[PDB]
Amino acid sequence: GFRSPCAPFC
Numbered sequence: 001g002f003r004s005p006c007a008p009f010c
Contacts, residue, residue: 004010
């Protein structure tokens with residue numbers, strides 16, 4: 001998966 005600490009807006 002792709003869980004970035006700015007998702008889903010960065």
